[PDB]
Design a protein around this motif. Structure first.
Motif, PDB file in Angstrom:
ATOM      1  N   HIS J  76       0.817  -1.211   0.000  1.00 45.62           N
ATOM      2  CA  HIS J  76       0.000   0.000   0.000  1.00 45.62           C
ATOM      3  C   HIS J  76       0.854   1.266   0.000  1.00 45.62           C
ATOM      4  CE1 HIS J  76      -3.952   1.857   0.405  1.00 45.62           C
ATOM      5  NE2 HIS J  76      -3.447   2.668   1.318  1.00 45.62           N
ATOM      6  N   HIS J 175     -10.183   9.399   3.931  1.00 45.39           N
ATOM      7  CA  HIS J 175      -9.220   8.609   3.181  1.00 45.39           C
ATOM      8  C   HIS J 175      -9.843   7.335   2.643  1.00 45.39           C
ATOM      9  CE1 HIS J 175      -5.418   6.993   1.885  1.00 45.39           C
ATOM     10  NE2 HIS J 175      -5.591   5.917   2.626  1.00 45.39           N
ATOM     11  N   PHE J 176     -10.854   6.804   3.330  1.00 45.46           N
ATOM     12  CA  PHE J 176     -11.562   5.655   2.792  1.00 45.46           C
ATOM     13  C   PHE J 176     -12.391   6.080   1.585  1.00 45.46           C
ATOM     14  CE2 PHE J 176     -12.381   1.313   4.260  1.00 45.46           C
ATOM     15  CZ  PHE J 176     -13.210   0.890   3.243  1.00 45.46           C
TER      16      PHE J 176
HETATM   17  C1  HEM Z   1     -10.355   3.328  -0.766  1.00 43.78           C
HETATM   18  C2  HEM Z   1      -9.150   2.769  -0.764  1.00 43.78           C
HETATM   19  C3  HEM Z   1      -8.184   2.937   0.339  1.00 43.78           C
HETATM   20  C4  HEM Z   1      -8.283   2.504   1.624  1.00 43.78           C
HETATM   21  C5  HEM Z   1      -9.428   1.749   2.247  1.00 43.78           C
HETATM   22  C6  HEM Z   1      -7.102   2.892   2.301  1.00 43.78           C
HETATM   23  C7  HEM Z   1      -6.921   2.578   3.650  1.00 43.78           C
HETATM   24  C8  HEM Z   1      -5.741   2.849   4.298  1.00 43.78           C
HETATM   25  C9  HEM Z   1      -5.426   2.480   5.619  1.00 43.78           C
HETATM   26  C10 HEM Z   1      -6.318   1.727   6.569  1.00 43.78           C
HETATM   27  C11 HEM Z   1      -4.175   2.926   5.879  1.00 43.78           C
HETATM   28  C12 HEM Z   1      -3.445   2.759   7.188  1.00 43.78           C
HETATM   29  C13 HEM Z   1      -2.573   1.505   7.173  1.00 43.78           C
HETATM   30  C14 HEM Z   1      -1.142   1.898   6.911  1.00 43.78           C
HETATM   31  O1  HEM Z   1      -0.518   2.487   7.755  1.00 43.78           O
HETATM   32  O2  HEM Z   1      -0.569   1.597   5.743  1.00 43.78           O
HETATM   33  C15 HEM Z   1      -3.697   3.580   4.728  1.00 43.78           C
HETATM   34  C16 HEM Z   1      -2.445   4.158   4.647  1.00 43.78           C
HETATM   35  C17 HEM Z   1      -2.016   4.880   3.543  1.00 43.78           C
HETATM   36  N1  HEM Z   1      -2.662   5.062   2.388  1.00 43.78           N
HETATM   37 FE1  HEM Z   1      -4.476   4.309   1.935  1.00 43.78          FE
HETATM   38  N2  HEM Z   1      -6.282   3.550   1.460  1.00 43.78           N
HETATM   39  C18 HEM Z   1      -6.872   3.612   0.258  1.00 43.78           C
HETATM   40  C19 HEM Z   1      -6.417   4.190  -0.921  1.00 43.78           C
HETATM   41  C20 HEM Z   1      -5.240   4.905  -0.967  1.00 43.78           C
HETATM   42  C21 HEM Z   1      -4.763   5.592  -2.087  1.00 43.78           C
HETATM   43  C22 HEM Z   1      -5.448   5.681  -3.428  1.00 43.78           C
HETATM   44  C23 HEM Z   1      -3.562   6.167  -1.723  1.00 43.78           C
HETATM   45  C24 HEM Z   1      -2.689   6.990  -2.581  1.00 43.78           C
HETATM   46  C25 HEM Z   1      -3.009   8.249  -2.855  1.00 43.78           C
HETATM   47  C26 HEM Z   1      -3.310   5.822  -0.373  1.00 43.78           C
HETATM   48  C27 HEM Z   1      -2.192   6.242   0.306  1.00 43.78           C
HETATM   49  C28 HEM Z   1      -1.902   5.815   1.593  1.00 43.78           C
HETATM   50  C29 HEM Z   1      -0.660   6.154   2.283  1.00 43.78           C
HETATM   51  C30 HEM Z   1       0.476   6.989   1.746  1.00 43.78           C
HETATM   52  C31 HEM Z   1      -0.724   5.572   3.491  1.00 43.78           C
HETATM   53  C32 HEM Z   1       0.332   5.624   4.561  1.00 43.78           C
HETATM   54  C33 HEM Z   1       1.155   4.335   4.471  1.00 43.78           C
HETATM   55  C34 HEM Z   1       2.219   4.316   5.529  1.00 43.78           C
HETATM   56  O3  HEM Z   1       1.902   3.997   6.794  1.00 43.78           O
HETATM   57  O4  HEM Z   1       3.360   4.578   5.244  1.00 43.78           O
HETATM   58  N3  HEM Z   1      -4.361   5.046   0.074  1.00 43.78           N
HETATM   59  N4  HEM Z   1      -4.679   3.520   3.764  1.00 43.78           N
END
Ligand code: HEM
Ligand SMILES: CCCCCCCCCCCCCCCCCC(=O)OC[C@H](COP(=O)(O)OCCN)OC(=O)CCCCCCCCCCCCCCCCC
Ligand code: HEC
Ligand code: HEC
Ligand code: HEM
Ligand code: HEM
Ligand SMILES: COc1c(O)c(C)c(C/C=C(\C)CC/C=C(\C)CC/C=C(/C)CC/C=C(\C)CC/C=C(\C)CCC=C(C)C)c(O)c1OC
Ligand SMILES: COc1c(O)c(C)c(C/C=C(\C)CC/C=C(\C)CC/C=C(/C)CC/C=C(\C)CC/C=C(\C)CCC=C(C)C)c(O)c1OC
Lengths: 236, 76, 373, 97, 164, 43, 38, 78, 64, 184
Positions: J76, J175-176
């Motif tokens: 991710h 973000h969701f």
């Molecule tokens: C609807 C779809 C998505 C869901 C449900 C979602 C959900 C989440 C969740 C639960 C986290 C926290 C877990 C973690 O720390 O990695 C997260 C982190 C993150 N998400 Fe998403 N996300 C989605 C789509 C996206 C998209 C399209 C992007 C890009 C623009 C994105 C970028 C990130 C980033 C940069 C993090 C931080 C990762 C890190 O801890 O280094 N997400 N997302």
């Protein structure tokens, strides 16, 4: 047994809860029901109502020292509470309650009325329906016959008697008065928004009574054209 | 789309302006009598089943009630 | 404009039959509801956690503290109930007026129903009450009925030996996605329909009399939306617990169970059917067929007339079908004891015999009466 | 039996809206073909009747009882033609197998 | 053709092998969270019951019921016709101590908790669909096909019953 | 040339050869890689 | 279904049978490698 | 902030496909226990997470045996 | 004095409750009437109970 | 078939220029990356808790106890990085080859770019590390710059005096929900 009907005032469609009673029922809970039951989800802030404003709640908020505060290690009970302090609990652990309840469990009563089918009635009935066991009654441990109770072996100790407590308002503390009053409070807590909502519902009924014939009139304007259309077949 | 739908011929279709026709023709006054006609026509075929049902529900409830009903004589 | 062309093509200049009754409002209501369920579900998801640790609590907090939470939560619950009311009336319109001859629309349709049913179980299990817990175990165990791979499948879904946190968190996602899923499937629905256009209550070719949709069936859909909102807000603001089971407000007793356990009304009959078949597997299958029998419906049409407006014997059979559907809804509620059981067994036999046998034979007889057969 | 037919006829009430039987036959492909072959006069007439029904249905009204197409009056125009179309499909099918 | 297609066939297997692998891990993710399925422990004392006391232990999210059987209970359960039982399992067949019976609380039917002290035959009952289990936990009445589950108590000594 | 005419010309057979091959290729790939990893990390 | 009852129709199927089995067969073996059933 | 940069060292896992030396992980787990465990705890790490040739399970459970605090010996007695 | 008691008493006085009580009295007497029997009377007890209770609510809350 | 006609109309029989280089791949890659992010995000959402007491604990539980949870989490994060790499190269292709004369496509693009940046910012806030919290305060503070309504807006978004649980939970919800708006 199917609990019969009861004429609760707040239950009136557009009417609301009688806080005075609610207040009285919060007293009843504080002096009787809190020894085995606790309004965990209810906080002194939640407790706020005409029955008890934040100020009064503060008094009660400061009225407790149980588990309101922790110590160097946050164990046992170590400090009194304040407005944000949530309702005190008769037991710091489920086992504690179980231990001090025949091994059975005195349920916190925050959503109790909602939980029980026909709760408000049930509650009243149970607290005041022990009645008489005519036969075949073998209450095992700290049980109390109550046909209203599902098993007639409630184990919810009958904690209310004539002048069980003393209402600060002075309203005679008869078992029933006490029962009814606390009922109100319990109901109030179960739905801290009962009054709030019914006001919305009244505004909703007035707005729909204004808006439904007007939207119907528009629709019948724009549909009159067709509803008057006259078709004629004129083969040459 | 409109146009190129059906070969309908010779079907004159007169109409009247919305603001020219009475705004809200009485519904209760004129429409409901026909509505009554409409409903009565079909109800004669609609309620019969439900007529049966209610009976079933009623009989069932009391029956189940008697079923639960214990006889002092039973095990007496 | 290539974005406005589709919007014009599906909502403004769409040629619609001039004589469609209010029933035809209901599907649009369903779309509005889905939107409502979803948006409400968002806020419900907000301030909510999938943790057995905090799921039941923050929700109580929603009911108690969340700004207008009590309103958004009970709007979500009663909007699920309104969704199933509009869904049942939509399916009944499709059965009565012969709209199942649009076979692709119907199949997107029958699938849609299964999906909506699941979202219900999803939304249902999520608050983590006594009733949710014991309801989940029950239907999850339904799967165990599978002849060979059943046990594994159940354990898979549960994510463990028995429903526990593992389930709650995953069920949370499906209940966040199936809504999005069903939404799309509906979009398929609208496409597979515009290719053919909507049906009319007479069941005839309405090509000679079609009107625009913007000024004629839009204000009608707006009026239907207003009436549905009136019923939804009088369900929320005046009787917020007439359709639910008080058990909900009981944090799940991983240990104890509700003396009386019942699936929600919308599915009550479904389970009623199960209760009827003695064999566990039989029940599961019949249950499925209960929903699936509909899909099977376009192959059972043996009449030369599409609608039931001019077909009185099949009208009588249809209202008997609605009658014993209501009977099966009542039986599900009743406990296991005489004579509720027998009614359940008959009602299920009558349901399957009316849909499978009696309606095509009646359509053949009706064609014989008009000197067509 | 014929009396029963007349009763069903009234019950069907397609007569009320002012439509003949052939008017209601679902437009299955087969039906479609026959409709097309109809001499224009009938086709245009069919359209008028069908459209009228639609309009009447919209207003939730039925024509004057008298105007209802009497069972006796009802005639079958599409059917004569339909028979042929069906036979045609039949002929093709076996030459097919 | 065989040279060009063999490349298409070769590639396919490769992709197919990767695609099964990717999909496999994902599928596996939703499998039992390792932390929670890392919980198989248990601790019970047989001396916690005077008589006729059912004692579940919430093991692995499942009721580790440990009902007690008074000689009377013991006497009837033995009297029960094993062959006539819906599930042929004599009371003793599921208990190595007549005074001690241990069962898992998942209704063979749809998995609810079968409340004890209920059921016509006595013993257990399940408010979900009316299955009545005898003290032995055998389904005597209801939509419950199999009897209640007997865990591997494997009691070592009267003092301690392992009940894995 | 025989192979093409036998397992790669009829699409159905094309799929058959693909599926069967994949069924065997995987286990092997896993083994080889695992083995290599092991030789590469002797402890 | 009436139309499906035809001798040629039958001939066609007979000629089509082997191929049908194959795809199903491939799918069958595929399911195996797909799950590794246990 | 001027921080002498860590002088990159040659770790047996520094390479692109180079795994960890598990005897060194076992020795470093001992280091933690005897020395730093005083003022550092592997909270997110559990003895089950100690599954690795570095330490096998049964022995790890013994380690699990060594530690004995706040398990909740008494739930009512806390 | 709990109005509950008073109202209960009053309702009992109601001929309806009087007759319901008649049933209960006859039935509770029946409870003691036979031993080997299973004349628990819980049913009749409940019968009177509900009947009287309806009357109670019909005229208790107001006193309350 | 009215569903297969659109699929044919946009992916099979679509007349494409024969000479477009590998740069024209990148937008399709972005779509794939979007799906990948959504899929990985869904499998992060079955174990993540948006509570300030438990967010870091849930992330460590994903990395340490969920089977291949470290794989989905780092997929991710690096897929967000790959999304921005492909986004920058897509925008650079549009700038170099004069594709901005498709003005409506370009404007829907820059709206998509704003939405993707907001989604990635709130997603980076989501694990509730040291860097996430200070980063959030910083950019949320950016809003305070607004001449008159700035303070209110900042406080609104924060949902309180300073970023705290109030923020984390609404940032999880936003973000969701935004990648589905990005898909539309
Ligand atoms: C609807 C779809 C998505 C869901 C449900 C979602 C959900 C989440 C969740 C639960 C986290 C926290 C877990 C973690 O720390 O990695 C997260 C982190 C993150 N998400 Fe998403 N996300 C989605 C789509 C996206 C998209 C399209 C992007 C890009 C623009 C994105 C970028 C990130 C980033 C940069 C993090 C931080 C990762 C890190 O801890 O280094 N997400 N997302
Ligand atoms: C990397 C360089 C790759 C390269 O070799 O560049 C030469 C290429 C020449 O372009 P041209 O002369 O049109 O010939 C193309 C057909 N051979 O020129 C190109 O490759 C053009 C590449 C267009 C896309 C470049 C994107 C660069 C990154 C831009 C990021 C920032 C975008 C704006 C952000 C605000
Ligand atoms: C000094 C002890 C004691 C007091 C005072 C007490 N209770 Fe209880 N209550 C119990 C015990 C013990 C149980 C557990 C019974 C069981 O689980 O079988 C219980 C259980 C209950 C239940 C659960 C019954 C059900 O339907 O599931 C209700 C409701 C209840 N009490 C209501 C009350 C109300 C209302 C009051 C006062 C207005 C009250 N109790 C005061 C000891 C008490
Ligand atoms: C005397 C108890 C104690 C021992 C034993 C101990 N530590 Fe620490 N450690 C501390 C304390 C106290 C700090 C924080 C000091 C500070 O932040 O100023 C710390 C901080 C650290 C830090 C963080 C440095 C930073 O930049 O934040 C690291 C890394 C560390 N120790 C490594 C180790 C290792 C490796 C061992 C085992 C050889 C170890 N320590 C043993 C007490 C101890
Ligand atoms: C994607 C949109 C949706 C989201 C995010 C969502 C989210 C949630 C959440 C968080 C809850 C738990 C809060 C509560 O107890 O009410 C919930 C409950 C529920 N949802 Fe949904 N939901 C969505 C769509 C739907 C739809 C379409 C339905 C109808 C099929 C549905 C039916 C339910 C039901 C029945 C409950 C239980 C309500 C109760 O406690 O009584 N939801 N939803
Ligand atoms: C997800 C739930 C559903 C939604 C949101 C939905 C929505 C719609 C909408 C908006 C229409 C066009 C309006 C209309 O025809 O009145 C429609 C038409 C239709 N739907 Fe549904 N539908 C759903 C489920 C179903 C199901 C389960 C069936 C089958 C029983 C069904 C059968 C039909 C039919 C037959 C039509 C065409 C009816 C006609 O216009 O004559 N739908 N649907
Ligand atoms: C016959 O005329 C029509 C018609 O042409 C259309 C397109 C619709 C569809 C109308 C809608 C408003 C669609 C449903 C509404 C939604 C919000 C769909 C929700 C699903 C999403 C994915 C969003 C009708 O309901 C309808 O009958 C009145
Ligand atoms: C010739 O012009 C085109 C083109 O017309 C299309 C449709 C695509 C789309 C290609 C795909 C593989 C579809 C996936 C791409 C997306 C952007 C998916 C979008 C869907 C969501 C974001 C949801 C191109 O990549 C492309 O350039 C090569």
């Amino acid at each position: 047994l199917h609990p019969p009907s009861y004429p609760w005032s707040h239950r009136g469609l557009l009417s609301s809860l009688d806080h005075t009673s609610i207040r009285r029922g919060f007293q009843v809970y504080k002096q009787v029901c809190s020894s085995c039951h606790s309004m965990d989800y209810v906080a002194y802030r939640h407790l706020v109502g005409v029955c008890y404003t934040e100020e009064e709640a503060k008094a009660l908020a400061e009225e407790v020292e149980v588990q309101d505060g922790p110590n160097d290690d946050g164990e046992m009970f170590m400090r009194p509470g304040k407005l944000s302090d949530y309702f005190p609990k008769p037991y710091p652990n489920p086992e504690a309650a179980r231990a001090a309840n025949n091994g059975a469990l005195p349920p916190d009563l925050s959503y109790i009325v909602r939980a029980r089918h026909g709760g408000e009635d049930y509650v009243f009935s149970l607290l005041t329906g022990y009645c008489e066991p005519p036969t075949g009654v073998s209450l095992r441990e700290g049980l109390y016959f109550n046909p209203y109770f599902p098993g007639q072996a409630i184990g919810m100790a009958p904690p209310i008697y004539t002048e069980v407590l003393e209402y600060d308002d002075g309203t005679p503390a008869t078992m029933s008065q006490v029962a009814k009053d606390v009922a109100t409070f319990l109901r109030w807590a179960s739905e801290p928004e009962h009054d709030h909502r019914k006001r919305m519902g009244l505004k909703m009924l007035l707005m729909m009574g204004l808006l439904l014939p007007l939207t119907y009139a528009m629709k019948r304007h724009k549909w009159s054209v067709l509803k008057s259309r006259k078709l004629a077949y004129r083969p040459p | 789309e409109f146009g190129n739908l059906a070969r309908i011929r010779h079907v004159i279709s007169y109409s009247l302006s919305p603001f020219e026709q009475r705004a809200f023709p009485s519904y209760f006054s004129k429409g409901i009598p026909n509505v009554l006609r409409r409903t009565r026509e079909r109800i004669l075929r609609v309620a019969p089943p439900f007529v049966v049902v209610y009976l079933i529900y009623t009989w069932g409830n009391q029956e189940f009630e008697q079923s639960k009903r214990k006889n002092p004589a039973m095990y007496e | 404009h290539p974005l406005f062309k589709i919007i014009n093509h599906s909502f403004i200049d769409l040629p619609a039959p001039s004589n469609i009754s209010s029933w035809w409002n209901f599907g649009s209501l369903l779309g509005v509801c889905l939107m409502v369920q979803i948006i409400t579900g968002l806020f419900l998801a907000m301030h909510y956690t999938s943790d057995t640790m905090t799921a039941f609590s923050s929700v109580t907090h929603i009911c108690r503290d969340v700004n207008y939470g009590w309103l958004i939560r009970y709007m979500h619950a009663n909007g699920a109930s309104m969704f199933f009311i509009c869904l049942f009336l939509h399916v009944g319109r499709g059965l009565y007026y012969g709209s199942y001859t649009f076979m692709e629309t119907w199949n997107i349709g029958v699938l849609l129903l299964f999906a909506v049913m699941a979202t219900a179980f999803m939304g249902y299990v999520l608050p983590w009450g006594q009733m949710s817990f014991w309801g989940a175990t029950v239907i999850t165990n339904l799967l165990s009925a599978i002849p060979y791979i059943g046990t594994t499948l159940v354990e898979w879904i549960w994510g463990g030996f028995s429903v526990d946190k593992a389930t709650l968190t995953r069920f949370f996602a499906f209940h966040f996605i199936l809504p999005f899923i069903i939404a799309a499937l509906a979009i398929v629905h609208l496409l597979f329909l515009h290719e053919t256009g909507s049906n009319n209550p007479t069941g005839l070719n309405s090509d000679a009399d079609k009107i625009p949709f913007h000024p004629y069936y839009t204000i009608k859909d707006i009026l239907g939306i207003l009436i549905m909102f009136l019923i939804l807000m009088t369900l929320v603001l005046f009787f917020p617990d007439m359709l639910g089971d008080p058990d909900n407000y009981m944090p799940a007793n991983p240990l104890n169970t509700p003396p009386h356990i019942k699936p929600e009304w919308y599915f009550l009959f479904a389970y009623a059917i199960l209760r009827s078949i003695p064999n566990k597997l039989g029940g599961v299958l019949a249950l499925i067929l209960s929903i699936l029998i509909l899909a099977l419906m376009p192959f059972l049409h043996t009449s030369k007339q599409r609608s039931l407006m001019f077909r009185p014997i099949t009208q009588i059979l249809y209202w008997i079908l609605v009658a014993n559907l209501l009977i099966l809804t009542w039986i599900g509620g009743q406990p296991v004891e005489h004579p509720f059981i027998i009614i359940g067994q008959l009602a299920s036999i009558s349901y399957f015999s009316i849909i499978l046998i009696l309606m095509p034979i009646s359509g053949i007889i009706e064609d014989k009466m008009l000197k067509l057969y | 039996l014929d009396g029963f037919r007349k009763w069903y006829y009234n019950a069907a009430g397609f007569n009320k809206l002012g439509l003949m039987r052939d008017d209601t036959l679902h437009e299955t492909e087969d039906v479609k073909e026959a409709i097309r072959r109809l001499p224009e006069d009938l086709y245009n007439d069919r359209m008028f009747r069908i459209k009228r029904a639609l309009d009447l249905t919209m207003r939730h009204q039925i024509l004057p009882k008298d105007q209802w197409t009497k069972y006796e009056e009802d005639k079958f125009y599409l059917e004569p033609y339909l028979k042929e179309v069906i036979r045609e499909r039949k002929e093709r099918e076996e030459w097919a197998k | 053709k065989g040279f060009s297609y063999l490349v298409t066939a070769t590639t396919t297997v490769g992709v197919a092998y990767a695609a099964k692998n990717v999909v496999s891990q994902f599928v596996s993710s939703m499998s039992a969270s390792a932390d929670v399925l890392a919980m198989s422990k248990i601790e019970i004392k047989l001396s916690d019951i005077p008589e006729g006391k059912n004692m579940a232990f919430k093991w692995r999210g499942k009721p580790l019921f440990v009902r007690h059987r008074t000689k009377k209970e013991i006497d009837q359960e033995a009297a029960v016709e094993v062959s006539q039982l819906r599930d042929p399992q004599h009371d003793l067949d599921r208990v190595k101590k007549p005074e001690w019976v241990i069962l898992i609380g998942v209704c063979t039917h749809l998995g609810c908790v079968p409340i004890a002290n209920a059921g016509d035959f006595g013993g257990y009952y399940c408010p979900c669909h009316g299955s009545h289990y005898d003290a032995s936990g055998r389904i005597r009445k209801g939509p419950a096909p199999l009897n209640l589950e007997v865990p591997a108590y494997e009691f070592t000594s009267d003092d301690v019953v392992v009940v894995g | 040339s025989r192979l093409y005419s036998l397992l790669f010309r009829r699409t159905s057979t094309f799929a058959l050869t693909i599926a069967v091959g994949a069924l065997f290729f995987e286990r092997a790939f896993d083994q080889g890689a695992d083995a290599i990893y092991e030789h590469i990390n002797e402890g | 279904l009436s139309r499906f009852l035809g001798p040629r129709y039958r001939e066609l199927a007979r000629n089509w049978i082997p191929t049908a089995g194959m795809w199903g067969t491939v799918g069958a073996v595929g399911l195996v490698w797909a799950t590794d059933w246990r | 902030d001027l921080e002498l940069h860590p002088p990159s060292y040659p770790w047996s896992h520094r390479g692109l496909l180079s795994s960890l030396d598990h005897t060194s992980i076992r020795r470093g787990f001992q280091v933690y226990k005897q020395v730093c465990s005083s003022c550092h705890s592997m909270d997110y790490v559990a003895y089950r997470h100690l599954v690795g040739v570095c330490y096998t399970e049964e022995e790890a459970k013994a380690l699990a045996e060594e530690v004995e605090v706040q398990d909740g010996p008494n739930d009512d007695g806390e | 004095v709990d109005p509950l008691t008073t109202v209960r008493e009053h309702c009992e006085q109601l001929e309806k409750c009087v007759k319901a009580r008649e049933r209960l009295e006859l039935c509770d007497n029946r409870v003691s009437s036979r031993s080997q029997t299973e004349e628990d009377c819980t049913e009749e007890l409940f019968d009177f109970l509900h009947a009287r209770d309806h009357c109670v609510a019909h005229k208790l809350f107001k006193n309350l």
